[PDB]
Symmetry: D2
């Protein structure tokens, strides 16, 4: 039940298809729509533990380019009240002299 | 200059193809140690001397093993004749909700061509 | 403002004093009601915050060693104090364990935590 | 072992005293307007198996001369030897409005040399 539409508190949403390959494809949301791609464990444990996954978005589309990219690392918790809990990293292009301020960290919980 | 073969501090290698649309596709070998990678990058970076932002994902499942884990690498590409990728990474393992708090490792890694 | 007792719904509390000189001093109780769950906290905070509605930057550290136990590890929380009818402190944390250099790649966990007064 | 003067790449220096109590005290910097107070904790009885010593400290970027309305925390470990080093991951948080809270925290890493 990863496949579907997910919403986050700050009002971002995304649409993903989970393939049998372990591939993740979709969009993160026209001028605000970006391509997403990632991977998940297509054979998780059945001991109650969640399903590890991660995905990337580059913040460039045919309308805008913020010269940066975000990655989300987390797990999927299934059932009726399904959730994806993540932590993310956002890196912007910078000079070497200013690389030390190039990466933000944060967290986000998604609901279906 | 992203397309190609990269090696890091202790024995990891990946082969990556950077596509016009901005896709990153390739293979990550942690040493049978090969795994699928996929990610995104800025295919129209600035020309003021800044680096090129990118990120990628590896889920540690191949046909030979499954670690119930995935790592994401976030960083930037730096050209030159000393071309490199500086990243920070997050590694999340599948856990029980009770153990969620210790689900995620953080680290950094530099890669060379 | 910051001075007082703070709780995280997962069964943890801390008592702190925010000093005139930017210092944070108190005790962290890992497990509500458990006296052997108590550790020294120390930190720093911005004693002259912006008055534009911004929160107050702060940080503290706890090494997980006391008279009772030693986990060979330390956590640092980085975040901000946000005033309101219900005051909160929003943080990101790092937990580092001692390891050999061979295992250093797995020495540090990252997470987040919110505390309410 | 930890007590002493430490250097990292960028050009930053910190002077610290490790107390018997697990206390870490010192300064992050010798000109005064670049000088900030640090406090932290360390594992005062590390494992005896080759492991490093866990430690952490905090700096609030306010002094008599300036205020950046932010704070950095360093989390890492000390590794002894004649090439002793401190390896750290860090978090820098700035005070923001409700609206900017999502970008209030930077992460990085840093190695310090004695």
């Amino acid at each position: 039940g990863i496949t579907g539409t997910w919403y986050n508190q700050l009002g971002s949403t995304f649409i993903v298809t989970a393939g049998a390959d372990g591939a993740l494809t979709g969009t993160y949301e026209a001028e605000s729509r970006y391509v997403l791609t990632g991977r998940y464990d297509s054979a998780p444990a059945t001991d109650g533990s969640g399903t590890a996954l991660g995905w990337t978005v580059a913040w460039k589309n045919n309308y805008r380019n913020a010269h940066s990219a975000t990655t989300w690392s987390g797990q999927y918790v299934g059932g009726a009240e399904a959730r994806i809990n993540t932590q993310w990293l956002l890196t912007s292009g910078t000079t070497e002299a200013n690389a030390w301020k190039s990466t933000l960290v944060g967290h986000a919980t998604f609901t279906k």
